[PDB]
Design a protein around this ligand. Structure first.
Ligand code: CLA
Ligand code: CLA
Ligand code: CLA
Ligand code: CLA
Ligand code: CLA
Ligand code: CLA
Ligand code: CLA
Ligand code: CLA
Ligand code: CLA
Ligand SMILES: CCCCCCCCCCCCCCCC(=O)OC[C@H](COP(=O)(O)OC[C@@H](O)CO)OC(=O)CCCCCCCCCCCCCCC
Lengths: 174, 172, 743, 40, 80, 160
């Protein structure tokens, strides 16, 4: 209402109302200066990437793909170097082509949610091969999204910690 | 004649409110230049820091210390802990977190001044103590804080000065 | 009721940030909004012209009072920083122990990009930039001793800065004085001449007598800084003071009684310079301030306020009139009590004049311990204060002209001195023009004559001490008078006020601090050149003030204003006929004048004073006495001064003095850059801009704030600014680099 | 606040902040990757 | 001396004749403009070439143009 | 080698410069002593000097007779690091700045007060527009072929 839940001492941030993971946490009012849709999309994307990164950061230390079996680095932070710039760039460039494809060229803050994609639900790409979201209630869908967001936020904080841990400690996470 | 209770020989300062702890004690009338709410927040902040500081200073000197002590952090008095914490990095950690909180506080104070309705010093955490109680008791508790806060400032000031002036055990 | 009272309006201006977000609020025209780039420049040029922002003297006055508080705050922060940097980034402690060897340094550079080379090995296990402001010497004289004390004075400075800033806000937004309050000259002078100066001197004397004198005696004797008692100890234990000065034993009893003689221990009239430090005796300085204090306090009781006794300035001014001056000084009081510009004119001129005097008196009579031997600091201070003075003097003239164009009223000035001056302006300017030509032709001619003669192989026909000689007889005479004064015309003195007039060579650390400076033909020639330069500057500036309102060419110049570009291409051309333009031209001549003066100082000193003396009497000056036979020709200055003394800057690369080399070059660049604004015109630039804008338009984009060329007046201003910066900057580096080496 | 933000949005102020940031990042890069005349 | 010419684009604002420092311009009756007046230069022998008139014209391009020319004592503003 | 130059790794002059530079710093450090803060600093400085020369030595830079590195810019990709690769960086960044600037100006041109938004920038909008410049190459080409970049003689011109 007039006061945010997360910050009971601060006025509730509007535009942060009725969203999936809203707890009223927007002390700096980014939701007013910038568009909510872009912000939502960004959060979800950051989260998904972080999730994967966290998992990979852990796995590489213990298991290596057959191709990279010869080169094994426990620090993980040193993996990027051992693999090579080309390999790293191949991944980033390929990501770019896929990003362009999915957003159909609307890859800028001024176009992502304009025109045909103006009605797109932030974070929705229609990717459900398993179809586990089949014939489910709206509530069920929403709860699932909440899970994704919460786990994503956790992953975002976790990955940073893992990387910086190795930097500070000097050795592998485990 | 609208005389300050604290100073029976002086007219009660205007611009003051009738809130808890208002005994008409503002001889220099700072309230005339600065909004009262800002001042009230400051008083609470200073006092709440001092109250906590006194406890910590005393306890460390008395002997209560974190068991897995860091490098050094032993054979060190409260008077000498600051530098040790700095080099260890504890002070940095504290400064970082404290500063972050102050940032959010800045946003809070502004809203309070703009009319959000936040009571100076109220952040919402009451532990349920104020839950259910009426204004009478609510105000009573607030007054008790205030009294403790003001007293605490005197206490901390004395402990620090005495200690440095006369290096010694907890009771200086 | 009382003639002098305090009138203040409460809550005059609301404090808010709204106006901050509305640039140009002060002006009616600018407030409308930006349509061309000119608006931007005008915003900055009309920011502090309160007279044009409001029509009420009260409002203008209120702003000035508050603005002054702001400057004071800035000054306090500046001083605070210096003391802090001297506490955390300096080698004062080491220097204090061995002042002769360790070099002063209070700035250190971060180790980024090889800039660390700039951190020199000054001494005392410290690496930093050698500063030349003279802070260390001053602190020693005050008796600082520790670096803790420096820290505390720094904190005091910060506090003071804040207080001033609050005062500014308070006296403009909460308690703004009314015009009646401001217009109380008699009271202000009484307070400022007795409180600010009198009490100030007395207070300083107290510090010098109770804290500085004792500590400095111990320091000079040899006591280690750490072994010298803390300042408070001297203040409490009278016995300690009695040991050093054996009169404190008697106490203040001699003072209340008439026996002031007993205090001869610390209050003295010795004269000369302390042999150990090479600075004026602090005992003499203490008596100086004490005596001045009494004088100022007495003077502060001359004007009437609220008790009948006193003088009314108006009456004094009006009474002084004569047969050749009509109504005399009538009307001046009203002008100086109703026009800020007029007041600024007089005050600014006097302030600048004082700075020039400080420069001369502070080298001949070194005031601080271990300052004379530090040639770098001496040169820096002389040049610095010489410049500040020149700018201020020209500024006084400028504001004087603004008065004539904006505040002068014919009605209030009938047959007064001002009116009569403006009625014979043609005569004054005509005569001054001749004086300038006479001096210039004769003075500079001497140099050209000599150059031609030396080049033609006819050295016997030169104006030199070895040929036709032009000796400065008058000056030589005054010098003798001052030399023989001690014991005669000044019976109670013990030595010459300055060793420059005559005496022995005072040496500290094997280096000459002061020595008799002799005057010959070369000195005559240079002194008269100084006269020429100053006279020409006055001509331009005075012409501007006198012909500010009207001229035979433009009879209505007043309506045009103080800063108009011209009146047109007619009348044969009326370009640069405003009073502002006269100031513009005057600054160029001031630059020339000061440049010659500082060069004279640098060469004369390095040739006939500074240097080293052996245990026995062998004096080796830095340049070798070349001034006598080389400064008599222009080629000499180019070769024996500029070309030779510039060997340091040009060869500074790879050293801690590399910065000076880079700045030397950079300054030359800026000086040349300015010549494009001073020789060109707005027309060419505007047309060029048009073509450039075409390009932007061709690509479907262009600024709504249409790009325009700088105004005629701004063009001139930008040119003068860069010209001055470049020229002064070049000499700055040249001097500093050379000085560091010679020291 | 709104008004102050406008002042902070003025051209002169924004330029100074931006340039300070730009200068800083350039300096920091040279601090950690110094002495480069080519991409290695 | 100098030559001052007025063009059909004049609007009879009278600003030019009010700016001349030597009374060279006058306002004469005319029908080409709404104001019903046009400027004339009857006494160009007293023009000093200031161009204040041009500075006052409001038309896109000056309707009053001053072309500097032969110089006389009057045009050179010589009081001596 | 190209231009008769020699690789810096094989240039004696280059090495002589290194030795000389280090010697100068070391001679200075001798005056100061042990862990004196001044000495430690000078010591660290020599390390940087040694590193710089080493980096250049391992590089493909070609030195001349003076023992100073000389850059090659004729288009050969052998020495692309010297000019071509860094050059792309400048072009990308410069275009970014120019493109975003033009975009903002054109965007605020249709506002209530098009001149107030140039002296007092709308930070929120500016940031949005600034982020959209990473694809400036593509956008520019698209605008050119759409006749939206270059204007068509509907612009003011001089009298002649
Ligand atoms: C080196 C450059 C230079 C020189 C020589 C001059 C010369 C002069 N300026 Mg000048 N000026 C200059 C640069 C220079 N300016 C610059 C850059 C500016 C821009 C700011 C100005 C701005 C300026 C202003 C605003 C004023 C002057 C004035 C003067 C005159 C001073 C009167 C005087 O001493 O006459 C003597 C002139 C000499 C050149 C002396 C040397 C001549 C010889 C040695 C003397 C004997 C020669 C004899 C007469 C004839 C010989 C015959 C044979 C050679 C054919 C003088 C004509 C002032 C003036 O006119 O008032 C009087 C004045 O108001 N100047
Ligand atoms: C943020 C995402 C991310 C990034 C940038 C990297 C980057 C890297 N990984 Mg890696 N990894 C990730 C996620 C990521 N990983 C995840 C989520 C896992 C768990 C399956 C792994 C498991 C893994 C192993 C076992 C190894 C690496 C290795 C490497 C390095 C070589 C790259 C390569 O060719 O193999 C990396 C790529 C893969 C192994 C396969 C594609 C990566 C995806 C994200 C994993 C599974 C695909 C799918 C999208 C995730 C779940 C499937 C789901 C859709 C059903 C490189 C630094 C190798 C190494 O250490 O180099 C010496 C190596 O041996 N990674
Ligand atoms: C915490 C994990 C988590 C969860 C709960 C979800 C949940 C969801 N995602 Mg999702 N996603 C995730 C991680 C997750 N995601 C990651 C890491 C990526 C990047 C690769 C994506 C990329 C992605 C896309 C591109 C899309 C979704 C969509 C969806 C929604 C419908 C699809 C569905 O039923 O997913 C069910 C998901 C799970 C039950 C998670 C299982 C995780 C297991 C434990 C890991 C197994 C890994 C292993 C290699 C596989 C075997 C649903 C709300 C779609 C959507 O928004 O449509 C409305 C859609 O288009 N997701
Ligand atoms: C003014 C606040 C303040 C400050 C600046 C410090 C500063 C310091 N303390 Mg200290 N301390 C304080 C208060 C403070 N203390 C209080 C109130 C206590 C009582 C428990 C202690 C108990 C304490 C011990 C036992 C030790 C220190 C130590 C130290 C030094 C290292 C930091 C450290 O270990 O912290 C550790 C601090 C604590 C463990 C205090 C815990 C207090 C509880 C857990 C927090 C209560 C929160 C409350 C219920 C609600 C508030 C929430 C929110 C507002 C934050 C450093 C000089 C160490 C030291 O110097 O060793 C030589 C050390 O061993 N402090
Ligand atoms: C006349 C005043 C003055 C001057 C010229 C200097 C100059 C210097 N000081 Mg110093 N100082 C001063 C006063 C002064 N100080 C005072 C009063 C104190 C006591 C607090 C100090 C305390 C002090 C310390 C403790 C240190 C210096 C250092 C330095 C040097 C590095 C400066 C620096 O930080 O660069 C870098 C500049 C910055 C990091 C500031 C960032 C730039 C800002 C963001 C731009 C301004 C933003 C702009 C105004 C926005 C406008 C908003 C609007 C509301 C106005 C430099 C030579 C440093 C030094 O020498 O180290 C070896 C150092 O460590 N000084
Ligand atoms: C934060 C406190 C505060 C606030 C909100 C205001 C607000 C206001 N003042 Mg005020 N003022 C203050 C403090 C404050 N003042 C103080 C401390 C002083 C004493 C110095 C003054 C002196 C003062 C005067 C004399 C005047 C105002 C005026 C104004 C009004 C117009 C604002 C303006 O001109 O923009 C100014 C905005 C700026 C950013 C200018 C700052 C320039 C800095 C200080 C120069 C120095 C910077 C640097 C050190 C030098 C270069 C390096 C506005 C209501 C004017 C007015 O409208 O009166 C009717 C006016 O004439 N004030
Ligand atoms: C004895 C009383 C007294 C004193 C000391 C001053 C002093 C001053 N007046 Mg002033 N003034 C006075 C009476 C006094 N006035 C009266 C009665 C009037 C009305 C007629 C005015 C009207 C007036 C105007 C209109 C202006 C001044 C200005 C100034 C300052 C000139 C700048 C300067 O020299 O910087 C020297 C700076 C310092 C010495 C710094 C310290 C300044 C503080 C305020 C000194 C106060 C005393 C101090 C606390 C010491 C107490 C002693 C204690 C330690 C024992 C200076 C601070 C000008 C100014 O800039 O004001 C801002 C100005 O424009 N005065
Ligand atoms: C006590 C000192 C003092 C004071 C209070 C004033 C006050 C005033 N003067 Mg004044 N003046 C002074 C000294 C002073 N002046 C001196 C010494 C000179 C001679 C140079 C002048 C010359 C002068 C002229 C010629 C004019 C004034 C004008 C004015 C008025 C408006 C000022 C203005 O436009 O603000 C705005 C202020 C500025 C734009 C100055 C900004 C600083 C510029 C950019 C130069 C910075 C140089 C910098 C130090 C170099 C750094 C180098 C670095 C970048 C590497 C105002 C009443 C003007 C007026 O109209 O009066 C009614 C006017 O036309 N004065
Ligand atoms: C007019 C001067 C000029 C210009 C414009 C060029 C332009 C070019 N040269 Mg080049 N070149 C020049 C003179 C010039 N050269 C001269 C005088 C020499 C002999 C020293 C060379 C020797 C040279 C080599 C050896 C190579 C180039 C290459 C290139 C191309 C760079 C590769 C790319 O894609 O872009 C580019 C077209 C490269 C190229 O063609 O890449 C495919 C390449 O390998 N140039
Ligand atoms: C100079 C001699 C002097 O002081 O005479 C002073 C002379 C006489 O002054 P009065 O005594 O008549 O006027 C007195 C009042 O001006 C107040 O002193 O005044 C002049 O006429 C100066 C003429 C221009 C100066 C010529 C150069």
């Amino acid at each position: 209402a007039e006061m945010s839940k997360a910050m009971p001492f601060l006025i509730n941030p509007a535009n942060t109302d009725g969203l999936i993971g809203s707890n009223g946490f927007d002390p700096l009012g980014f939701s007013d200066t910038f568009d909510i849709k872009w912000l939502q999309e960004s959060e979800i994307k950051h989260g998904r990437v972080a999730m994967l990164a966290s998992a990979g950061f852990i796995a590489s230390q213990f298991v290596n793909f057959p191709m990279y079996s010869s080169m094994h680095v426990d620090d993980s932070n040193m993996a990027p170097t051992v693999v090579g710039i080309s390999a790293m760039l191949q991944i980033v460039c390929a990501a770019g082509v896929e990003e362009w494809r999915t957003y159909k060229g609307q890859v800028t803050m001024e176009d992502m949610f304009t025109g045909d994609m103006a009605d797109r639900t932030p974070g929705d790409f229609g990717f459900d091969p398993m179809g586990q979201l089949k014939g489910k209630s709206e509530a069920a869908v929403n709860e699932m999204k909440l899970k994704e967001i919460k786990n994503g936020r956790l992953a975002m904080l976790a990955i940073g910690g893992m990387i910086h841990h190795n930097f500070v400690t000097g050795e592998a996470l485990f | 004649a609208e005389k300050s209770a604290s100073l029976p020989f002086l007219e009660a300062p205007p611009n003051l409110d009738g809130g808890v702890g208002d005994l008409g004690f503002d001889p220099f009338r700072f309230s005339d230049f600065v909004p009262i709410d800002f001042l009230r927040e400051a008083e609470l902040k200073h006092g709440r820091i001092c109250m906590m500081a006194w406890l910590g200073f005393v306890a460390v000197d008395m002997g209560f210390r974190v068991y897995p002590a860091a490098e050094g952090f032993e054979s060190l008095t409260s008077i000498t802990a600051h530098d040790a914490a700095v080099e260890q990095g504890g002070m940095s950690q504290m400064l970082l977190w404290f500063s972050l909180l102050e940032v959010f506080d800045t946003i809070a104070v502004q809203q309070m001044l703009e009319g959000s309705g936040r009571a100076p010093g109220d952040f919402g955490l009451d532990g349920g103590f104020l839950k259910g109680k009426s204004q009478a008791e609510i105000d009573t508790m607030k007054l008790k804080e205030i009294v403790h806060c003001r007293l605490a400032m005197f206490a901390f000031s004395g402990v620090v000065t005495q200690a440095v002036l006369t290096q010694g055990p907890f009771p200086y | 009721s009382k003639n002098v009272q305090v009138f203040v309006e409460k809550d005059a201006v609301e404090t808010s940030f709204a106006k901050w977000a509305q640039p140009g609020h002060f002006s009616r025209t600018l407030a409308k909004g930006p349509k061309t780039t000119t608006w931007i420049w005008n915003l900055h040029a009309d920011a502090h012209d309160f007279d044009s922002q409001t029509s009420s003297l009260e409002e203008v006055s209120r702003k000035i009072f508050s603005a002054h508080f702001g400057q004071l705050a800035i000054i306090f922060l500046w001083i605070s920083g210096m003391h802090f940097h001297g506490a955390y980034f300096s080698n004062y402690s080491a220097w204090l122990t061995d002042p002769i060897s360790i070099k002063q340094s209070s700035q250190v550079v971060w180790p980024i990009v090889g800039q660390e080379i700039l951190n020199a090995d000054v001494g005392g296990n410290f690496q930093g930039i050698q500063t030349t402001s003279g802070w260390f010497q001053m602190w020693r004289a005050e008796g600082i001793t520790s670096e803790v004390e420096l820290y505390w004075t720094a904190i005091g400075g910060l506090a003071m800065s804040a207080i001033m800033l609050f005062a500014g806000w308070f006296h403009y937004h909460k308690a703004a004085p009314k015009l009646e309050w401001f217009q109380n000259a008699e009271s202000m002078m009484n307070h400022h001449l007795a409180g600010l100066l009198g009490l100030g001197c007395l207070s300083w004397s107290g510090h010098q007598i109770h804290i500085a004198l004792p500590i400095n005696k111990l320091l000079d004797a040899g006591v280690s800084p750490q072994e010298i008692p803390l300042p408070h100890e001297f203040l409490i234990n009278r016995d300690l003071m009695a040991q050093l000065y054996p009169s404190f034993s008697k106490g203040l009893a001699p003072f209340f009684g008439g026996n002031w003689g007993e205090y001869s221990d610390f209050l003295t009239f010795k004269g000369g310079l302390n042999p150990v430090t090479g600075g004026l005796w602090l005992s003499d300085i203490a008596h100086h301030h004490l005596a001045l204090s009494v004088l100022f306090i007495i003077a502060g009781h001359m004007y009437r306020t609220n008790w009948g006794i006193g003088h009314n300035m108006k009456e004094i001014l009006e009474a002084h009139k004569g047969p050749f001056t009509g109504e005399g000084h009538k009307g001046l009081y009203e002008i100086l009590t109703t026009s800020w510009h007029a007041q600024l004119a007089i005050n600014l001129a006097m302030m600048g004049s004082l700075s020039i005097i400080v420069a001369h008196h502070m080298y001949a009579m070194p005031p601080y311990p271990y300052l004379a031997t530090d040639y770098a600091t001496q040169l820096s201070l002389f040049t610095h204060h010489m410049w500040i003075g020149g700018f201020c003097v020209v500024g006084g003239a400028a504001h004087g002209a603004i008065f004539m164009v904006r505040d002068y009223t014919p009605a209030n000035n009938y047959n007064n001195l001002l009116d009569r001056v403006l009625r014979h302006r043609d005569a004054i300017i005509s005569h001054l023009n001749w004086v300038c030509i006479f001096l210039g032709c004769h003075a500079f001619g001497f140099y050209i004559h000599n150059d031609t003669m030396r080049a033609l192989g006819r050295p016997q026909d030169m104006f030199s001490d070895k040929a036709i000689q032009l000796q400065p007889i008058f000056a030589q005479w005054i010098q003798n008078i001052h030399l023989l004064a001690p014991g005669t015309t000044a019976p109670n003195a013990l030595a010459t006020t300055s060793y420059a007039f005559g005496g022995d060579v005072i040496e500290v650390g094997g280096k000459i601090a002061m020595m008799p400076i002799k005057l010959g033909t070369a000195d005559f020639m240079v002194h008269h050149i100084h006269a020429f330069t100053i006279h020409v500057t006055v001509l331009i500036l005075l012409k501007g003030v006198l012909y500010a309102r009207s001229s035979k060419l433009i009879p209505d110049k007043a309506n045009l204003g103080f800063r108009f570009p011209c009146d047109g291409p007619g009348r044969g051309g009326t370009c640069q006929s405003s009073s502002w333009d006269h100031v513009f031209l005057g600054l160029f001549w001031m630059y020339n004048s000061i440049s010659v003066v500082i060069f004279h100082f640098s060469w004369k000193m390095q040739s006939d004073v500074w240097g080293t003396i052996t245990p026995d009497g062998a004096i080796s000056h830095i340049t070798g006495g070349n001034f006598a036979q080389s400064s008599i020709t222009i080629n000499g200055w180019l070769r024996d001064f500029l070309w030779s003394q510039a060997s340091q800057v040009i060869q500074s690369y790879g050293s801690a003095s590399s910065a000076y080399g880079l700045i030397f070059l950079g300054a030359h660049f800026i000086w040349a850059f300015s010549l494009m604004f001073l020789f060109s015109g707005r027309g060419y630039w505007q047309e060029l801009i048009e073509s450039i804008v075409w390009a932007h338009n061709k690509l479907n984009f262009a600024p709504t704030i249409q790009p325009r060329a700088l105004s005629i007046t701004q063009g001139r201003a930008v040119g003068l600014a860069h010209y001055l910066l470049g020229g002064i900057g070049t000499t700055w580096a040249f001097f500093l680099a050379r000085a560091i080496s010679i020291t | 606040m709104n008004d102050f933000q406008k002042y902070l949005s003025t051209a002169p102020v924004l330029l100074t902040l931006w340039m300070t940031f730009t200068a800083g990042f350039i300096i920091e890069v040279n601090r950690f990757f110094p002495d480069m005349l080519g991409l290695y | 001396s100098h030559t001052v010419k007025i063009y059909d684009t004049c609007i009879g604002c009278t600003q030019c004749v009010r700016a001349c420092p030597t009374d060279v311009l006058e306002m004469v009756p005319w029908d080409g403009c709404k104001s019903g007046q046009i400027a004339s230069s009857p006494r160009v022998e007293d023009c000093v070439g200031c161009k204040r008139c041009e500075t006052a014209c409001p038309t896109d391009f000056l309707s009053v143009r001053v072309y500097l020319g032969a110089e006389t004592t009057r045009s050179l503003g010589l009081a001596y | 080698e190209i231009g008769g130059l020699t690789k810096c790794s094989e240039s004696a002059a280059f090495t002589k410069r290194l030795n000389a530079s280090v010697k100068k710093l070391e001679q200075r450090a001798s005056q100061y002593e042990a862990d004196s803060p001044p000495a430690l600093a000078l010591k660290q400085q020599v390390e940087r000097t040694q590193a710089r020369f080493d980096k250049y030595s391992r590089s493909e830079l070609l030195c001349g007779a003076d023992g100073l590195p000389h850059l090659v810019a004729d288009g050969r990709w052998s020495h692309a690091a010297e000019f071509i690769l860094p050059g792309f960086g400048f072009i990308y960044i410069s275009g970014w700045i120019g493109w975003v600037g033009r975009k903002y100006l054109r965007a605020v041109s249709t506002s209530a007060n098009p001149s107030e938004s140039e002296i007092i920038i709308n930070v929120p909008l500016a940031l949005k527009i600034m982020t959209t410049g990473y694809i400036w190459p593509i956008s520019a080409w698209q605008e050119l072929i759409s006749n939206d970049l270059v204007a068509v003689s509907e612009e003011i011109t001089v009298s002649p």
